[model samples]
Target: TGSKPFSVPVLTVEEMTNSRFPIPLEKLFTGPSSAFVVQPQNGRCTTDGVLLGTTQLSPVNICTFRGDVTHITGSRNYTMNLASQNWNDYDPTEEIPAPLGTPDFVGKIQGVLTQTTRTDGSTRGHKATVYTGSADFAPKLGRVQFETDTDRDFEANQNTKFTPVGVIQDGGTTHRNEPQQWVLPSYSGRNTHNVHLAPAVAPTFPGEQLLFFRSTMPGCSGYPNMDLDCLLPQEWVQYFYQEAAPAQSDVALLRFVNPDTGRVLFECKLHKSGYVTVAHTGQHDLVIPPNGYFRFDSWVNQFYTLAPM
Candidate 1:
């Protein structure tokens, strides 16, 4: 027989205590033919559903011991034989599911307010018309990705909401709107993903004009970087970590953008206190009145004014 030894006739306790062949403890019950169950790792079984193991983890199987037939019914202190494959590796915990929500938007006022020429020079008649424009709400990261490229971490939902600033035209009424943040679809409320963004308006001004989305949040202390995909742009995805608010500061992060063009209007981080001393990086045009008020205007009649009370 082009054969190795067989285990069917198996080993009798008397022969198995093979001092001559002296099987080491590690290989004692394991081989092409042995009678012991080999268990899976991490205390797992099957798929989807699972079975945990006891203090001793592994598998076991039982079979009929045939050799005893020759011994007539049985012998003293006899048991059956078994065999098993090596343990396979597996995770004990469940995996993270795919994200299933889209990004949302809000309308922004981006155009300039032009003083309407009133035939009658009434002081109160000085009204302004706002040419309109809009842009993407939060530039969200689409497709699929992981939090840390190296680890088991996958992109997760931050449950963050984008904040919108209020808008008003000169001599026009101030429009106050409620803001909504998006949580992961699996983690959001009924309409968190269904609600439509604020209505966008087109510029009525004679020449090319614009409108934008600019706003701030008190700073979500827990809004960790990339906790949600909505926070980053596509180019930044392959990196391993996410961005977060700085420590000891009340504000998390703030952004201002051309809601109409997605251009950055302004962005900055807040220090613990002492006036918002600086605009976020590349916000070269931001200026404060130093004490009372300030007005900002882009290339055209567009001007963003902030008057302190």
Candidate 2:
């Protein structure tokens, strides 16, 4: 992220998805065990090769060691999918495509820039290397957690069980990384094991882990305080919730899990203004289709410098 542009805003995938399919996506989630087709979240569908973001905003500097964050890799444990306990079959092919071809399930950078209110009660400037990763990249899934220990806001208290920030759509179209901010429906909690986070997790990348697959999308936002039935704008409801389920602003945490290998390639703990703590980062431990192994992984904060211009 060596760019010095006027405004490079990266909207959260939740925002981008909301913009494209601007109707509460009730088309697929109306049943038990529902699934939706995976679509391109980055690049032009079918053949937009080359990762979407401009080279100016590419994932470069973060790979360097002179950034704000130390970053983590393969330090924590996460979920994985196994067939007969065969973790060797794992493949990231369909996970995050290479930078050479168009994408089916991907994302891109929306822009570059974050607004940090100065002590004077006014947003003053925008800094570089402060902002990176958004809807402008690949098929980056959000995060993979909803717990007290992982939640950035509730970290001070120990033994405090995780409190869910939103509900899982179970399955949705991957064409675009549209975020869903869900409220723990008192009515649906019993039926759906809401916020049942698997704490046995790991960081997204082990130090110097090779880069086999990469996807970075924006985090979810909620309307604040996990409450259901809050009347939301029709525009927001149509794209995110069919019945004002919840807004992205209040999402407790972003989530992602490799179904085939169960290795949570990356788990970004959401911080203020979408900054996330790089949780688990590593190869797919579950067995699916055996893709190339990632040699390295890095944190978003380390690569991008952001300042409100």
Candidate 3:
């Protein structure tokens, strides 16, 4: 009885934040890790504030945790290193109901034989045989075994328990047969609502994209672009003037910023759907009508109503 060769298991990082959320989560930790932060409202401290410290490397945008609804608001935040640090009995909730096998090792394997294709058209100048047995492995069932093998639909929601990652794009014909759900929290009194300091109220899905925007669908009933974050496309940024705008007080007005950090981060017209496929383009490749985005929310936001041009 023989079979051996498996040396690639060392995902320390202090168990990496209880490490679970990984369904279709795509990528994570090519280096510093941690990932997951929805602070806001006293922003959870850190970044020279030090409370929940260790998260100031920036670029951690993409949400869906204040109310989750299946998943997909992306998820990135990181920086919680763990260079094989030994902290004895460190238990991050024992990785929460997420352990199955692996970690049973007994190594020593070396095989080298370039061209040895034998069966009938044979060629084996260097035969091989390195015996050893029993070294079972399996524990990589993320997002708690995808909600423990689909019994909880990836943690049910709060946006798949905050971006548990996606896939299954079901429902045939290109998408929507069923396989992703949860929507309803465009602020159903978001428990108490306190976005920064409130004040601009009224938005259970309003303006731009005109009416109908509930996403996080599947059994979420109609209106679905597979959850294109509460409808979109209301761009509005027309500033043309190489040298015009001096018709008022000492005019020097030449604004055009957002170089990743010129600041202007005003979200909550409900963004987080790849910001409308990257600022809704024109003349082409902007499709979306198979009832997706609900027929572009009836005639495409405050429109002139052309028939799906």
Candidate 4:
């Protein structure tokens, strides 16, 4: 058995919706067919954000099912997109429980290899293999497996359900830490029952949509780059300018027009996670929406903050 390669098997477009979210995250796809990762800033576990996005030809974004927390916000709805700050702020732990392991397929692998970083700062070339119980080689566990994996740590409030497609950030799918799928709630509630609306919300409704935001963390709890991801820098925010915006966007909006003078202005923001080192940023290999606008949330590392040079 050699290094195994595995990707989070994506749901077909047929099983999606167009309510107000993008199907299959854009960050999961638009990236080098190889690498895109991010290194955490500090071990202290700060509540910050980074400016990371993908550049894909199709609608690429991952999705996370809505768990129990959604009811607390008066919106008993959940989406697989990490586009809004409130979504980003939500604790992934409520969805993902600790001891992030899976049902059988249990094993452990440890190895090392050398990789190269290119101009755009993406990584490439490493040893890894792909596997699954199928011929096409699909992992039994996908985003649904990871997004639900969570811990109660202060820093556990984030979207961690990602498919390691590009490179060897982890070992074999069978060996490396399998993605966490369901996080147990500390306190049960009246609406603790999990409900999936795939079959109900369809045809002129919010079908099953998935939006994935990629974050490759080599130094998850390590990295001296604090104060970086706190706010996205201008350079970091430009990745999604034109051919990048996720299918979640109606027109891949490039400019905002002025009401009075008809001036064109672009919407951009800075990184919220200062000192954060982003690795390869890509989401779904594609997205599929029904009729009408792509209501999926746009996943971009944006902020409403500006600083003087």
Candidate 5:
């Protein structure tokens, strides 16, 4: 038997949103319109000093590109001319200014190499085999899988689990450990039931809509890091069954505000689905309508968007 190379799809911002790939932009900044795709990279920058994205490590500022991107015909590679398009090092702690301008450089969209435990075979994963001029191949990165369950962890108040199947550290060593579980804290009720466990018996009210927010917890819990503060932050994917009428526009502007201080920690717009993945790693509350009912759904970590099977 022979093994053939698998061509990973280099996705666009629209295709990523439609397919629900976790981009981790909502947690840091909010904008009316900014279409970009994340590309994994090491800490190093290009010869021209352009920052690259990373799969692991703290202060993970993912590299993103925006503007016109052209895909080569009959190939898995895409090109982004630096003259028209631009790239940015998306850091949560900083403001996103205008896209960085650089000298004429033709950037290729060859997908990064990553290993996954979901598949069954000796051929674990695939790396970029072909590299064009001025285009460099990325290192093989690790992958974490999101495992959901209906069972509740009363002690931890968690519903979902993140298993580190094949985690590659900064030193190029593989680190595999026990899975970390997360909780969806109830806002108003004593115990919130997972929507899957307790299905909605009645249809949503005439104008009401179901909103889901997945926010991160402050500091790291499961993994160890040099910082010891937030090496591996956990997230909560709670829901708000807003009784108020749905947003008039197609996109719902959802905001997570600090209830006591009235400070907006995170804000993003959602499509008709009314679900958004928050990247902010801290304690924050979503502002629901006065008559809204806050609840929890089955442990589905919409934050960690999984690749299509």
Candidate 6:
């Protein structure tokens, strides 16, 4: 009976254009027969090689995909076919052919030399010696004082001896033994900052537990907030929805209809399992059918997605 692919009817341009989260009516019977809750994965690594790290930026930092669903008579299970170009296959250290631009000095430094004459002459009379050795000098010769632009504006000389100033040293040309920020390579062709989808082969779901789908893209709420990641641009979302849909077996039609008007407000055919694999990080509602229950996956990392508003 539900075999026909339902096309979302666009009646009003205004209604379809808005990006607000759609609130589904609880009483409406137009929802999915079963729903999956893909929780937000914390920005961390997992034991099963599902690495959610912070080494990269934007799309590269997050890996998401639609789940490949295996539908049983009464229950449906899900698996994620991660692309070889995805984060799992990416090596941040190697893929980035070049490291960050050479560490340049963040601020400018100005120095002045002061000379003093010995009033109480012992060996030489009225001898003036220009002392320009180390910053350490006798109290009578005026100690070295480092000042920032603010101090210069106020015309005040403040002792910055105890101030924690970052010092960039030129140890060597190679980035070896350097901090992560200095040594981490730039995003290469394979690690471009663009939204990615699961591949046709290479299953990431190892039959350990049920993997739910959610979007961590900008505008979604909950832990691992936007500060941890960049906001998902509207263009990206537009492009993401345009990508090819997952296999029919893995797809489930989720429709939200207006209880009063009986008009469809939002609808999408999403993966029952791998949807979360393609989602960014954010908080979303978990849809569960009356008979639906969560299956345990071995991984402890969290994930999120944008679905059913």
lDDT tens digits by residue: candidate 4, 190-220: 2333221111110111121112232332222
Error of 3 at 111 (Å): 30
Query: Considering every candidate listed, which one attains the maximal TM-score?
Result: 5
Q: Tell me the spans in candidate 5 whose CA falls farther than 4 Å from its real position.
A: 1-166, 169-248, 263-267, 273-309
lDDT of 3 by residue, 1-309 (tens): 121211111222112111111111111111111121112111112111121111111112111111111322232111111111121322223321111111111111112111222334333211111111111111111111111212222222111112222222224444453222221111112132212211111212222221111223222222223322111111100011111112211111111123345432111121211111111112222222222111111112311222221
Regions of model 3 farther than 4 Å from truth: 1-143, 146-166, 169-175, 179-309
TM-score of 2: 0.16
TM-score of each: 0.15, 0.16, 0.19, 0.17, 0.20, 0.18
lDDT of 6 by residue, 1-309 (tens): 333232223222212211111111121112121132212122221211122222122232121111111112232211112212221332223322111111111111122211122343222111111111212211111122232222112111211111111222124444222221112111222233311211111113321122222222221112212111111111222323344222234434435444455554443333333232322123334443322212222222332222433
Ranked by TM-score from best down, the candidates are 5, 3, 6, 4, 2, 1
Stretches of model 6 off by over 4 angstroms after superposition:
1-249, 272-309
Candidate 5 lDDT score relative to the true structure: 0.22
Worst 10 residues of 1 by lDDT: 61-70
By TM-score, the better pick of 1 and 2 is 2
lDDT of candidate 4?
0.21
Candidate RMSDs in Å, in order, are 36.5, 24.8, 22.3, 21.5, 23.2, 25.1
As a TM-score, model 6 comes out at: 0.18
Q: Which is the better candidate, 1 or 2, if ranked by lDDT? A: 2
Name the lDDT of candidate 1: 0.18
Candidate 2 wrong stretches, greater than 4 Å: 1-105, 125-309
Question: Please, what is the whole-model Cα lDDT of each candidate in the order they appear?
Answer: 0.18, 0.20, 0.18, 0.21, 0.22, 0.22
Residue-level lDDT of model 2, residues 1-309, one tens digit each, is 432211111222222221121222111011111122212222111011122211111112111111011112332211112111121332323323221111111111111211223344332211112111222222112111111111122211111111111212113333223232121111111233212111111122233211111122222332212111111111221222222222223112323334467564343322212112232224332222233121112223432322211
Candidate 1 structure quality by residue, lDDT tens digits, 184-296: 12112223232222122222222212111111322221221111101111111111012221222222233333434545433332111101222221212232222211112
Which portions of model 4 miss their true places by more than 4 Å? 1-173, 181-211, 219-309
